[PDB]
Structures are given as C-alpha cells and as structure tokens.
Amino acid sequence: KKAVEQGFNVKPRLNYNTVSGVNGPLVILEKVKFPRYNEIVNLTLPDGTVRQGQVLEIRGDRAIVQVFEGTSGIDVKKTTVEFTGESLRIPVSEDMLGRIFDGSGRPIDNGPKVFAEDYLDINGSPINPYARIYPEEMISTGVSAIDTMNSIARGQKIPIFSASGLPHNEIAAQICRQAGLVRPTKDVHDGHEENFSIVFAAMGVNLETARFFKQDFEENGSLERTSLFLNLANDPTIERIITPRLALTTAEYLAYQTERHVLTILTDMSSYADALREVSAAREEVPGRRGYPGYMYTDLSTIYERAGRVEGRNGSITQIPILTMPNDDITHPIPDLTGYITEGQIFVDRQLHNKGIYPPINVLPSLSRLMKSAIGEGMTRKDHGDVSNQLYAKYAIGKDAAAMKAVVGEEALSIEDKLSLEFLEKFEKTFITQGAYEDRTVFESLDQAWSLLRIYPKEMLNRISPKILDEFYDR
Amino acid sequence: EQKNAGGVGELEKKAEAGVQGELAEIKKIAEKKKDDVVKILIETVIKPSAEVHIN
Amino acid sequence: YGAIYSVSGPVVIAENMIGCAMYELVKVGHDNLVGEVIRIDGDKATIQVYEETAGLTVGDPVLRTGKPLSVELGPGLMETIYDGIQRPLKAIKEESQSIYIPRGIDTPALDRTIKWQFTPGKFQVGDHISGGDIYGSVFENSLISSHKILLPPRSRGTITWIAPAGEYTLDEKILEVEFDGKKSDFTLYHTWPVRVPRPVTEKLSADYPLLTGQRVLDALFPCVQGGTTCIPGAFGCGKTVISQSLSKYSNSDAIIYVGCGERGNEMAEVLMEFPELYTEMSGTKEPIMKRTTLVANTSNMPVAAREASIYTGITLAEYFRDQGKNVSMIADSSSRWAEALREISGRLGEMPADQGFPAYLGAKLASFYERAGKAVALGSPDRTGSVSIVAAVSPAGGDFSDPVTTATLGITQVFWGLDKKLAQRKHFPSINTSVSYSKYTNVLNKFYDSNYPEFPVLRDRMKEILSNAEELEQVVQLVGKSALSDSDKITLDVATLIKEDFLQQNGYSTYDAFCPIWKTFDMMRAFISYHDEAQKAVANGANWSKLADSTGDVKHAVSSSKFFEPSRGEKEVHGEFEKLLSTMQERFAESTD
Structure with missing residues (x-):
C-alpha cells in the first residue's frame, strides 16, 4: 500500500516581520524558532512582490536567508518572510514527461502545475556500494560521430567538451531529438515495453538559445519523451544550481521507480560552476583554485554519480553533461574535474567548426571509456568495434599525413597516405558531417562507415579481424 | 505542402478527442472523490497537534 | 548527556559536553549520527559528524561513546564487506532492504547473532x-x-x-x-583504536619472499611478506591481475582489501569479482572470500570513512598478524585517501603545505607504512605474523609528481611499474621493467642462499641483459640493424625471448596461472643458460645466424618451458627442467662444430 497519508498532516509555517538588515543577496533574521539547517522561504516585498529564498547558516537563534533574484528594495520595517516546512522538494509524477520547467520546478508552458505523485528530496541519497552493477547496453544518439565511434553505454557518464562559440547546444538538441535504444532496431520492432525518456537541463542558457530549445523540442516528438528544464542567464543563479538537481531527481525517479531508460543531458556546466562560485562567495568563504570553491569536486561527483544501472530496478540513467571550456584548456578546473569523474569525453573542435563541418566532433582526443560494453553481437552489430578501431586508425593516419603535406610534398607520400587523404576528405565530408535534422540509425552509420572504409583493400585494413572482413567487406 | 496542411484539422480533431477523453475521466474522479478529499482536509485543518520540539 | 549547539556543514559544536576525550567518537542527534571530536573549548567540543547534517536540530542530545575510532576485532569479520568506518554493508542492506545506506544506521560491525x-x-x-x-x-x-x-x-x-x-x-x-x-x-571480540599501531613483542626484518606467482615481479622485483609495495593505480594499467594474484595465489594467510575513494563502477566490479574468485591450496576448492575481508568506499561516502579506510584495513591486518597469520593489505588507491585528507584539511581550514596537502601527509604515510612488517606477536605462545602493504597510487593528472606519490615511492621499498603501453600491446602483467625496482633484493639474499643460491646472480644478469637490449634498441634505430655485432644480436634475441616467454604470463591459462618460486628459478636458469651458451659459442665459434637458425628447437623448448604444469609436483618439474637443460647443453655442443 501507499503510505502517503502523512501528507494530510498540517504544520504551522510562521511569518516573520523581523528582518534586521540586508547585505547583498542575503537577508538576516534574528528571531526564528528551533534552528535546523536548510529550509525554503517565500518573502514578500513591501510593495507586495512575493520573492523566494533559501536558508544558509544556522547557530543559536541564527538564520540567514539568501533571497532569489536579489534583495532590491527590501527594508527592515515592512518586509515579511514565510518559512515553509522543509527544504526544496520537486513535485514528481509519471506524466511529467512532455512538460517544460523553470529552474525552480514551476512549469513555464501553458499547462498547470504538475499533479504530484510524491515530493522528492532534491539532494538524493548515497547508493550502497553493495548494490551497483556495470553499464551493459548501448544508447543510440543518432549521431554517427557518437554511434560508430565514441559509443555511449546505457549508464555511462560521458561529457561533451566544447568552447564558448561552438554549437554544443545544437548537438545537444539533436541528441535529445534522436536518442533512443538500439533494441527496437535490433529486436525487429518487437521491443516496446522498454520505454525511453530524456531529461534535458539548460543552465545559464541564453534567452535565444532557450527559445530555440523549447521551440525545437515542441515541434518534434522529442517532447513527449522529454522532461525539460531551462534557466536563463538573467534568472537567479541559485536557480541555475537547483536546475541540475531537479533534472537528476526527475531522471532518478523515472529510471529507478518507473523502470524507464532515461538519458540526462546537462547544458553549460560552466555556468553552473560560475553559480557555484557566486554562492560560495556569498558566504564569507575563502576562494579556491581559479576562484572556484574548494569542494567543486564533491559537488560534481554528487551530480554525476546519479547515473548508471542499479541492482534490481530495470531502469538506467545515461548522463551527457555539456560544458564550455573557458580558455580552450583541459587544465581548467571544470573540464579537469569532469574528466576525473566521468568516463571519457567527446570533443567539439574549434578548427573543425570553423572549417564548416557539423557536427564538429573531434574523434582523435575523444574516447568513450565504456565503449566495450556497448559493443557486441546482440548489442548493436557484430562489426561495430572493429569498424570503429579501423576508422580511428585511418583517420589518424590521414591527419598526420595531411600535416606532413606541407613538409615533404604530396608525391613523397605512400599509397597508405594517398588513400588516407582520400578517406579523411570523404570521412569529414560525409560521415562526421551529418545534417542537424538527419537521424542515422546505428546500423545505417555502420553501413556508411563500411562504404567509406571500402576504399582500402582488405589487406590494408589491419585493425579489423579477417573474420569480419570475410563477412562485411563484400556487399 | 497542401497535403501537409490538409491534416492540420485532423490533427487538431485528434488532439481535442484525446483531451476530452482524459478530461472525462478526470472530471469523473474529481466528482467521485471531492467530498472525501474535502472532509479529510477539513478534519486535518480543524484538529491540531500539540507537541514540544525540544525532543 | 550532551546537546547540539551549532551546526555548519559537517562540523557540529556540542555544549555541556564535559568529559569527552580528543578523538572520542560520539552519537550525534536522535539519528545517532557518528561524529569525531576534533576541538575542545571547556564543555564545548567540536564534532566532525560523518554523514549529512541537514536535519540536525540545536538541542538534540549527543552521547559520547567513550572510545576513539575503534574497529571491532574478532570472529565474523572474515568474508564480510565494510566501509571505511567498518559498517557491514551486507548486513546494512539485509536489515533495511533499501537501495541506499540509511543515515545514522548502527548495525554492529560483527554479526552478534x-x-x-x-x-x-x-x-x-x-x-x-x-x-x-x-x-x-x-x-x-x-x-x-x-x-x-x-x-x-x-x-x-x-x-x-x-x-x-x-x-x-x-x-x-x-x-x-x-x-x-x-x-x-x-567476549569473543574487542575494539581497538584504529590509529594507534597494534603492538608487537619485536619487529623483525622481513626476509621471506611474498611469492605472488607473477613471474616478472617474483623474480625481477621481489617483495617480502612484511614489506611495502607501490603500484600505479591508473586506468587500464592491469592492476586487477596484481590484486587478484595477491588475493588468490600469495603466501598470505589472510587478505585485506581497502577501497579508499574509488569510483562507484570500479568498486562494484571489485565487489562482484572477489566473491567469485577461488583459492589455490588443495586444488582450488574454496573461495578467497573466506580468506579476504574488504573495505569498500565509493566516490561519494562520508569523507571521514574514506580517510579512515586504510587505517581500518591496516588495523585488521595487524589483528590477524598478532595471531601469527601472514597477511597482505591491498590499497585500492592511496591517492584517493590523500584526497580525503586534503578535503578534511580544507574543511578544517588547515594551512596547505604542498599543492594543498597537509604538512603531516608525509609523516602519516611513513607511520602507516611502518605499521607493516614481520613481527613477533605480543603475548604467549611465541608466534610470528607479518603485514605487507601493496598500495596503489593514481595521480589526478598522471604527472607522478604530486607529494603523495613521491612520499609513497620514497617510503615503499618495491615499486611495480604497471604501464599503459604494455597493456595496450596486450602484454601482461604489463610491468615496465625499466622503471620498476625492488630494494628487497639484498635482504632476500639469505632466503635465496638457503633455498635457491643461484637466484640473485641470475636475476641481476637478466636485469642487465634487458637493460643492454633496451639501449641497443635505440642504437639500432640510430644506425641500422646491420651495424650490430653477433653478441649484440644474441642479447637482443635473448631479451625478446624473455619478454615473450618469461615476463609475459597469461594468468588465465592453467599452466601459468601460478608460477611457483622453484619453477621461476628453473626458468631463470634456462633463460640465463641459453644466453650464456649462445654468447660463449659465438665468441669462440662461427657466426650467430647459422647457430640461431639451427638451434631454434632449443629456443622453442625454453619457450615451452613456460607451459610446464606446476601441478605435476616440484620434484617432477625440477627433474624435467634438468632434462631440458641437459638436452640444451648437448644440442648446443653438437651445433658448435
């Protein structure tokens, strides 16, 4: 039975017109009864404007409230603040799919407030080490740059590294509109009870880009499978911190209670890190390396580990955090910690973007740390791993031969390098180059990779076993 | 393009049919359980609990 | 007794808490969260609560246990899985039937039933x-x-x-x-403070080898039961074979495996592989879990548990050492423990000494590694145990220059240098001979002269021939293949044969899953004799090419020497090796004509 009858209990939420002073985005209350660490408030401006905020510090009769969207016009004689029961909790339900939410969880579409099934704590819980299992399937993103190579396992935490001006948002939108299980393609359209869902979180997202996300997912079938979140740049930044927490709470609920396969996409983790910096400096806290808080490792670990397959429950969480390199450097704290926590990464290259190729995934520096589990016979197709390895090797050979083009001349190269230049041109122009609205299924991507790898004779395909060559080369 | 525009009315009709189908069940459930929900809420609000949060 | 006064993150101040010790653990709040005292101000004691404190209320009673962080030593901690602070994760799951660990759970570390x-x-x-x-x-x-x-x-x-x-x-x-x-x-169990080393009557000099079965490290870079070892914990280096060989084939009478701060996926792989891993004695009839206890901590746990993981593991190892059982403690990642120390110091606001690490990191590592060693156990009867530590290091950037790995390399006497490149080329156990070293070779001279007297000279002869071939590889790449002398090509081929058939060990195969020390020494003799006979014959005979082409059968025989089943019996294997050497000598004598 559902032991939710405790929700009918009513608790006295108090109102305090006892603001002693205002200091930045913080307001301080002297007389608040029986302090406990974190709560949620709804304070009203003297002109009646209702504003929301959080609780930061607790000591003997000590309470400090960090008001959302600043503390402009807050006085000490008229403002009143209402203390809700406990910390932030998202109204979560199965029919949350197809809804668009603000960073605070309030829907921004024309639909009503979500009809809650339960209010879930936002922080989460520590998964027992005795109850974890390995990611052992494949999530097809429809992007051949990510399917044939850099395959994403069903539970893998793999980021997408990009820079400020590059179209990482477009790649995220394409992945969200095209993501799905390979099994319906593999099971001959027999498998449908393995429902697939997507949780898309936008953090610090620009107003035009947020509008693009909303309009694009609305105008496609992605929304029906997607629970969507936005957080504008001019929106409160602690809402930007809340947004990934809300997204991962929704994804965890769906996957580990409704037994769905959920793909979680987090956009612009750099904006989230900036919000972390701002909130950490809001309290009198010493800054860390490059100004970021010293515990950013732990916070990113908490966000990222809310992923993967678990013992018992049939669902899964696949996470694709997307972040912008502040100075195109790996050594920056955000990409460094993201690589240290996640599995592999996907690189969106600046030069590859300037050369007019989309989607500009740079294959060489990008790896998927759990690609082996996504590859198999029943899993995807048999030749997948060998084709990926051969493509990577041929692309690297083409790349360094193209580098040598300007040192030894074209005529000084071997037939290896001639075929490699031809392969690189056709590769970066037809295989990596994929239409923004073009959905290559994994088998279509493998077929294209074969038709492009058929340039070389079977002798020159070293990275692929002859057992596969005798099966797939001749078609 | 005209054939695509031909289904605009059909798609709207299907959406309205689905909305009405869901709304029928929603209204039926609300009518059936509104009295019970109101009674439970009134009982919860009118009956307070006295306790000391020291323990 | 006590009462909560102020809470801020993981630190809690408790008023009217007079009579609490320095590091005395306490039960914080109605949830009875466990916390360690770190500062005292009269009756007010500063408590570092382990779990989340978002629910604590100012006024919640806090009860002092009266003891520091103590591990429960006694029957029932074998075959069990623990966290850093020894919480029975298996019992935790069974009693609660919950996916996550309940906050404030207090299941006894040892099964009381x-x-x-x-x-x-x-x-x-x-x-x-x-x-x-x-x-x-x-x-x-x-x-x-x-x-x-x-x-x-x-x-x-x-x-x-x-x-x-x-x-x-x-x-x-x-x-x-x-x-x-x-x-x-x-009772049958007693609690011991985790940080104080468990005393012994006398600490001896560790001189008996820690035979793991891996031929490359059992011969080239040996370790003594009671010694300290450092290995890279980097991704895909193949440390799994090292951990499974120490926990599966070593001389240890018990195994302590500690996961300091390892990622969740890797810890899951360890926790699934270990139960299905079986022993070697009496013919692979028992699970090594009966011999092994684990300390498991995922990426996100109480930071104090991660910091105390290795201390709990070494305390269990010392407890079993005091029984006379040679134990070996394997650390999943010392770098993760160093990170836990760094985050603890950052929470306490201590002064960063080197790259953000506390100043006592070197002292802490030195003391922890000195906790290990062969020692006469305290009390009667007179039994001798030993604790050996095989600690893994994994720098974040891989530079191998942060102070934790430098201190570990300075303290640990033997370093098994697992390499990315060797694992990439499917060469296992992927130990880089050029960078690896062992300072226990001199100590083991007594054991060798007592058992296998020829061993040390064979070992360093193989060391120098592989070093010579390594440098002549660069020589070849510099000048050309033809510029080599006959003896140089002898060295090159002998080193390649060694790398293929002695250092490389399949492990999964039945014949070389566990290479005993006598079989290792016999292969030492075979390979060194092959090199010496080729060298002498070419020095006082004809060209090398004809001899090597004619004597390829002997090379194949010494290659198949890797395939000799150790289960046939030590005497039988030694006699067959003697036959192989006799035929080798005779056939080289025939060829040199």
Missing part, C-alpha cells in the same frame, strides 16, 4: 594473562580453521573464569580477569 564454536586454550583459572595471549580459538570458516582470539593488548590480569568449550555469540562473555581487585569481562 552467529554462534561460534569456541575451544578454550592452555590458559586456566588463576593463571596470569597479558595482552595478546591466546586464551582460545574459534573455527570461523573452512579456510581460517583456527581464529585465535586474543586478550586485548592493553589488558592484563589474573584469570578468574573461562567459558568451557561450546558455541557462543560475540555478546557472550567468555573470560574474567582480575586486576587490582576489579573484574573485567571479555
């Missing part, structure tokens, strides 16, 4: 007993036949009552001693 068969020792009523004296043994499992229970090292007195033979639970008292009039009750 299991009835243990107890046979009393030689000590009788009225006798004088001191710390470490075996006053009985408990049949724990089929592999740990006799779990010698000990009087706690700090306790002593005159025995006034002993429970007779029978079955008892860990809550049952089985020993009464009298000291200065007051009585004391002793």
Whole structure:
C-alpha cells in the first residue's frame, strides 16, 4: 500500500516581520524558532512582490536567508518572510514527461502545475556500494560521430567538451531529438515495453538559445519523451544550481521507480560552476583554485554519480553533461574535474567548426571509456568495434599525413597516405558531417562507415579481424 | 505542402478527442472523490497537534 | 548527556559536553549520527559528524561513546564487506532492504547473532594473562580453521573464569580477569583504536619472499611478506591481475582489501569479482572470500570513512598478524585517501603545505607504512605474523609528481611499474621493467642462499641483459640493424625471448596461472643458460645466424618451458627442467662444430 497519508498532516509555517538588515543577496533574521539547517522561504516585498529564498547558516537563534533574484528594495520595517516546512522538494509524477520547467520546478508552458505523485528530496541519497552493477547496453544518439565511434553505454557518464562559440547546444538538441535504444532496431520492432525518456537541463542558457530549445523540442516528438528544464542567464543563479538537481531527481525517479531508460543531458556546466562560485562567495568563504570553491569536486561527483544501472530496478540513467571550456584548456578546473569523474569525453573542435563541418566532433582526443560494453553481437552489430578501431586508425593516419603535406610534398607520400587523404576528405565530408535534422540509425552509420572504409583493400585494413572482413567487406 | 496542411484539422480533431477523453475521466474522479478529499482536509485543518520540539 | 549547539556543514559544536576525550567518537542527534571530536573549548567540543547534517536540530542530545575510532576485532569479520568506518554493508542492506545506506544506521560491525564454536586454550583459572595471549580459538570458516582470539593488548590480569568449550555469540562473555581487585569481562571480540599501531613483542626484518606467482615481479622485483609495495593505480594499467594474484595465489594467510575513494563502477566490479574468485591450496576448492575481508568506499561516502579506510584495513591486518597469520593489505588507491585528507584539511581550514596537502601527509604515510612488517606477536605462545602493504597510487593528472606519490615511492621499498603501453600491446602483467625496482633484493639474499643460491646472480644478469637490449634498441634505430655485432644480436634475441616467454604470463591459462618460486628459478636458469651458451659459442665459434637458425628447437623448448604444469609436483618439474637443460647443453655442443 501507499503510505502517503502523512501528507494530510498540517504544520504551522510562521511569518516573520523581523528582518534586521540586508547585505547583498542575503537577508538576516534574528528571531526564528528551533534552528535546523536548510529550509525554503517565500518573502514578500513591501510593495507586495512575493520573492523566494533559501536558508544558509544556522547557530543559536541564527538564520540567514539568501533571497532569489536579489534583495532590491527590501527594508527592515515592512518586509515579511514565510518559512515553509522543509527544504526544496520537486513535485514528481509519471506524466511529467512532455512538460517544460523553470529552474525552480514551476512549469513555464501553458499547462498547470504538475499533479504530484510524491515530493522528492532534491539532494538524493548515497547508493550502497553493495548494490551497483556495470553499464551493459548501448544508447543510440543518432549521431554517427557518437554511434560508430565514441559509443555511449546505457549508464555511462560521458561529457561533451566544447568552447564558448561552438554549437554544443545544437548537438545537444539533436541528441535529445534522436536518442533512443538500439533494441527496437535490433529486436525487429518487437521491443516496446522498454520505454525511453530524456531529461534535458539548460543552465545559464541564453534567452535565444532557450527559445530555440523549447521551440525545437515542441515541434518534434522529442517532447513527449522529454522532461525539460531551462534557466536563463538573467534568472537567479541559485536557480541555475537547483536546475541540475531537479533534472537528476526527475531522471532518478523515472529510471529507478518507473523502470524507464532515461538519458540526462546537462547544458553549460560552466555556468553552473560560475553559480557555484557566486554562492560560495556569498558566504564569507575563502576562494579556491581559479576562484572556484574548494569542494567543486564533491559537488560534481554528487551530480554525476546519479547515473548508471542499479541492482534490481530495470531502469538506467545515461548522463551527457555539456560544458564550455573557458580558455580552450583541459587544465581548467571544470573540464579537469569532469574528466576525473566521468568516463571519457567527446570533443567539439574549434578548427573543425570553423572549417564548416557539423557536427564538429573531434574523434582523435575523444574516447568513450565504456565503449566495450556497448559493443557486441546482440548489442548493436557484430562489426561495430572493429569498424570503429579501423576508422580511428585511418583517420589518424590521414591527419598526420595531411600535416606532413606541407613538409615533404604530396608525391613523397605512400599509397597508405594517398588513400588516407582520400578517406579523411570523404570521412569529414560525409560521415562526421551529418545534417542537424538527419537521424542515422546505428546500423545505417555502420553501413556508411563500411562504404567509406571500402576504399582500402582488405589487406590494408589491419585493425579489423579477417573474420569480419570475410563477412562485411563484400556487399 | 497542401497535403501537409490538409491534416492540420485532423490533427487538431485528434488532439481535442484525446483531451476530452482524459478530461472525462478526470472530471469523473474529481466528482467521485471531492467530498472525501474535502472532509479529510477539513478534519486535518480543524484538529491540531500539540507537541514540544525540544525532543 | 550532551546537546547540539551549532551546526555548519559537517562540523557540529556540542555544549555541556564535559568529559569527552580528543578523538572520542560520539552519537550525534536522535539519528545517532557518528561524529569525531576534533576541538575542545571547556564543555564545548567540536564534532566532525560523518554523514549529512541537514536535519540536525540545536538541542538534540549527543552521547559520547567513550572510545576513539575503534574497529571491532574478532570472529565474523572474515568474508564480510565494510566501509571505511567498518559498517557491514551486507548486513546494512539485509536489515533495511533499501537501495541506499540509511543515515545514522548502527548495525554492529560483527554479526552478534552467529554462534561460534569456541575451544578454550592452555590458559586456566588463576593463571596470569597479558595482552595478546591466546586464551582460545574459534573455527570461523573452512579456510581460517583456527581464529585465535586474543586478550586485548592493553589488558592484563589474573584469570578468574573461562567459558568451557561450546558455541557462543560475540555478546557472550567468555573470560574474567582480575586486576587490582576489579573484574573485567571479555567476549569473543574487542575494539581497538584504529590509529594507534597494534603492538608487537619485536619487529623483525622481513626476509621471506611474498611469492605472488607473477613471474616478472617474483623474480625481477621481489617483495617480502612484511614489506611495502607501490603500484600505479591508473586506468587500464592491469592492476586487477596484481590484486587478484595477491588475493588468490600469495603466501598470505589472510587478505585485506581497502577501497579508499574509488569510483562507484570500479568498486562494484571489485565487489562482484572477489566473491567469485577461488583459492589455490588443495586444488582450488574454496573461495578467497573466506580468506579476504574488504573495505569498500565509493566516490561519494562520508569523507571521514574514506580517510579512515586504510587505517581500518591496516588495523585488521595487524589483528590477524598478532595471531601469527601472514597477511597482505591491498590499497585500492592511496591517492584517493590523500584526497580525503586534503578535503578534511580544507574543511578544517588547515594551512596547505604542498599543492594543498597537509604538512603531516608525509609523516602519516611513513607511520602507516611502518605499521607493516614481520613481527613477533605480543603475548604467549611465541608466534610470528607479518603485514605487507601493496598500495596503489593514481595521480589526478598522471604527472607522478604530486607529494603523495613521491612520499609513497620514497617510503615503499618495491615499486611495480604497471604501464599503459604494455597493456595496450596486450602484454601482461604489463610491468615496465625499466622503471620498476625492488630494494628487497639484498635482504632476500639469505632466503635465496638457503633455498635457491643461484637466484640473485641470475636475476641481476637478466636485469642487465634487458637493460643492454633496451639501449641497443635505440642504437639500432640510430644506425641500422646491420651495424650490430653477433653478441649484440644474441642479447637482443635473448631479451625478446624473455619478454615473450618469461615476463609475459597469461594468468588465465592453467599452466601459468601460478608460477611457483622453484619453477621461476628453473626458468631463470634456462633463460640465463641459453644466453650464456649462445654468447660463449659465438665468441669462440662461427657466426650467430647459422647457430640461431639451427638451434631454434632449443629456443622453442625454453619457450615451452613456460607451459610446464606446476601441478605435476616440484620434484617432477625440477627433474624435467634438468632434462631440458641437459638436452640444451648437448644440442648446443653438437651445433658448435
């Protein structure tokens, strides 16, 4: 039975017109009864404007409230603040799919407030080490740059590294509109009870880009499978911190209670890190390396580990955090910690973007740390791993031969390098180059990779076993 | 393009049919359980609990 | 007793808490969260609560346990899985039936319900007993036949009552001693402060080799049971074979595996692989879990648990050392423990010494690694145990220059340099001979001269021939293949044969899953003799090419020497190796004509 009858209990939420002073985005209350660490408030401006905020510090009769969207016009004689029961909790339900939410969880579409099934704590819980299992399937993103190579396992935490001006948002939108299980393609359209869902979180997202996300997912079938979140740049930044927490709470609920396969996409983790910096400096806290808080490792670990397959429950969480390199450097704290926590990464290259190729995934520096589990016979197709390895090797050979083009001349190269230049041109122009609205299924991507790898004779395909060559080369 | 525009009315009709189908069940459930929900809420609000949060 | 005064993150101040010690653990709040005292100001004590404190209320009673961070030592901690602070994760899941760990859970570290068969020792009523004296043994499992229970090292007195033979639970008292009039009750288990090293009568010099079975490190870079070892914990380097060989084929009578701060996926892989891993003695009939206890911590756990993981592991290892059982402790990642220390210091606001690390990191590592070593156990009878530490290091950037790895390399006597490139080329166990080293070679000279006298000279001869071939590889790439002399090509081919058939070990194959020390020494003899015979014959004979092409059968024989089944018996294998060497000598004599 559902032991939710405790929700009918009513608790006295108090109102305090006892603001002693205002200091930045913080307001301080002297007389608040029986302090406990974190709560949620709804304070009203003297002109009646209702504003929301959080609780930061607790000591003997000590309470400090960090008001959302600043503390402009807050006085000490008229403002009143209402203390809700406990910390932030998202109204979560199965029919949350197809809804668009603000960073605070309030829907921004024309639909009503979500009809809650339960209010879930936002922080989460520590998964027992005795109850974890390995990611052992494949999530097809429809992007051949990510399917044939850099395959994403069903539970893998793999980021997408990009820079400020590059179209990482477009790649995220394409992945969200095209993501799905390979099994319906593999099971001959027999498998449908393995429902697939997507949780898309936008953090610090620009107003035009947020509008693009909303309009694009609305105008496609992605929304029906997607629970969507936005957080504008001019929106409160602690809402930007809340947004990934809300997204991962929704994804965890769906996957580990409704037994769905959920793909979680987090956009612009750099904006989230900036919000972390701002909130950490809001309290009198010493800054860390490059100004970021010293515990950013732990916070990113908490966000990222809310992923993967678990013992018992049939669902899964696949996470694709997307972040912008502040100075195109790996050594920056955000990409460094993201690589240290996640599995592999996907690189969106600046030069590859300037050369007019989309989607500009740079294959060489990008790896998927759990690609082996996504590859198999029943899993995807048999030749997948060998084709990926051969493509990577041929692309690297083409790349360094193209580098040598300007040192030894074209005529000084071997037939290896001639075929490699031809392969690189056709590769970066037809295989990596994929239409923004073009959905290559994994088998279509493998077929294209074969038709492009058929340039070389079977002798020159070293990275692929002859057992596969005798099966797939001749078609 | 005209054939695509031909289904605009059909798609709207299907959406309205689905909305009405869901709304029928929603209204039926609300009518059936509104009295019970109101009674439970009134009982919860009118009956307070006295306790000391020291323990 | 106490009462919560102020909370801020993981630190809690408790008022009217007079009479609490320095590092005395306490039960914080109604949830009874465990927390460690770190500062005292009169009655106000600063508590570092382990779990989340978002629910604590100012005024919640806090009860002081009276003891520091102590691990429960006794029967029932074998085959069990623990966290850093020894919480029985298996029992945690069974009692709660919950996916996550419940906050404030207090399941006993040792199963209080299991009835243990107890046979009393030689000590009788009225006798004088001191710390470490075996006053009985408990049949724990089929592999740990006799779990010698000990009087706690700090306790002593005159025995006034002993429970007779029978079955008892860990809550049952089985020993009464009298000291200065007051009585004391002793059950099958006793708690020991985790950070103080468990005392021994005398710490000897570790001289018996820690035979793992991996030929490359058993021969080239040996380790002594009671020594300290450092290995890279980097991704895909193949440390799994090292961990499984130490926990599967080593001389150790018990295995301690600690996961400091390893990622969740990797810890899951370890926790699934270890139960399905079987022993070697008596012909692979028992699981190594009966011999192994684990300390498991995922990426996100209480930071204090991650910091205390290695201390709990080494305390369990010392507890089993005091029973006379040679144990070996494997650390999943010392770098993760260093990160836990760094985050603890950052929370406490301590001064960063080197790259954000605390100033005591080197001292902490030195003390922890000095906790290991062969030692005469405290108390009677006179038994000798040993603790050996194989700690893995994994720098974040891989530069191998952060202070933790430098301190570990300075302290640890043997370093097994697993390499990315060798694992990429499917060469296993992927130990980079050029960078690896062992300072226990000189110590093991006594054991070698007692058992295999020819071993050290064979070992360093192989060392120098591989070094010579490594440098002549660069020479070849510089000048050309034809510029080599005949002896140079002999060295090159001998080194390649070594790399293919001695250093490389399949591990999964039955013939080389466990290479014993005598088989290792016989292969040493075979390969070194091959090199020496080729060198001498070419020096005083014809060209090398004809001899090598003609003597390829002997090379194939010494290659197949890797395939000799150790299960045939040590005497049979030694005799067959003697036959191989005899045929080798005869056939080289025939060829040199």
